[PDB]
């Protein structure tokens, strides 16, 4: 019987317990997956599963804001395009003289008066 | 032999089957990791691995759009800076009178005519 | 003893080794979780844990840029609102004639001169 007592004992050491052996490695695997504290700070605390689910919703969120902003900037580009194509005129010289508008330039009123 | 029959039976219950024991806990671990349905909605359906890979590419994507938008807004800020520094003039009073441009103000033409 | 030799051998095949059995499935599970090469390209290379932690910081980052850009565009919308509400005037006709400002329109100076 001493051979089977041997072999049997080897398998016990082998399956191990919560702290060692196959049973110890699997306990650690489930601890990591599930997590210690769901409202925890770390990935290990939350567990793999909860961390993946969180990243998921956060990505989804940033994406929504990014779709909204892209739209805002498109309207912004059109607003600026409009102002640029408006053909506004810049201030006339400030030199104590009166000016009027002719062919793109600002001309001295006194040249007609 | 009754002691070894004992010990042996204990290890069987211990390794368990697909539904229980160490074999049951590991089956669940591989189910979660791999997934039930890859084109599935949930993290558990897709499996941990596929979920992490997905978040990965999605992050990468939002990042590209965010780099592109940042550039668009930089050109926008310069376009607005330009329009602000242009020195355009605002509408002259609407009061039935003619005005001309002198030193920042709008002056009545009749003051020269 | 041949029955227990039987049962014992079955459990050995069952716990298996690094390559097969329960011991083989758990070895693979820990390989995937931890990773082969942390500065590796793939999710499997980095390990599940390191991949989740990475996605995490990257999401956090894109989020910061997205908060900053949103602010930039808000100031941009106000800058454009301001320019639009300014009431600037567009270029006067380019036809060899002098013009002055009256009631929204550009009038020929010669109509007073
Ligand atoms: Cl993730
Ligand atoms: Zn000229
Ligand atoms: Zn004045
Ligand atoms: Zn008219």
UniProtKB/Swiss-Prot annotation, chains A, B, C:
Residue ranges annotated as coiled coil are 22-33, 48-83
Q: Where in the cell is it found?
A: Virion
Q: Where are the transmembrane segments?
A: none
- Reported modifications of this chain: Cross-linked via an isopeptide bond to E.coli host protein DncV during infection.
Q: What does this protein do?
A: Chaperone involved in tail fiber assembly and retraction. Acts as a chaperone helping to attach the long tail fibers to the virus during the assembly process. During phage assembly, twelve fibritin molecules attach to the phage neck via gp13: six molecules forming the collar and six molecules forming the whiskers.
Subunit note = Homotrimer. Interacts (via N-terminal domain) with neck protein gp13; this interaction allows attachment of the fibrous collar and wiskers.
What's said on domains?
The central domain consists of 12 alpha-helical domains (19-40 residues long) with coiled-coil structural patterns.
The protein's name: Fibritin
Q: Which organism is it from?
A: Enterobacteria phage T4
Q: What is the lineage of its organism?
A: Viruses, Duplodnaviria, Heunggongvirae, Uroviricota, Caudoviricetes
């Amino acid at each position: 019987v001493s051979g089977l007592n041997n072999a049997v004992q080897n398998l016990q050491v082998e399956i191990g317990n919560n702290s060692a052996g196959i049973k110890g490695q699997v306990v650690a695997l489930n601890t990591l997956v599930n997590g210690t504290n769901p409202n925890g700070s770390t990935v290990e605390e939350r567990g793999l599963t909860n961390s993946i689910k969180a990243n998921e919703t956060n990505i989804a969120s940033v994406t929504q804001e990014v779709n909204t902003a892209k739209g805002n900037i498109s309207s912004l580009q059109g607003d600026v395009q409009a102002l640029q194509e408006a053909g506004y005129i810049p201030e006339a010289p400030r030199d104590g003289q009166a000016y009027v508008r002719k062919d793109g330039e600002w001309v001295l009123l006194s040249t007609f008066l």
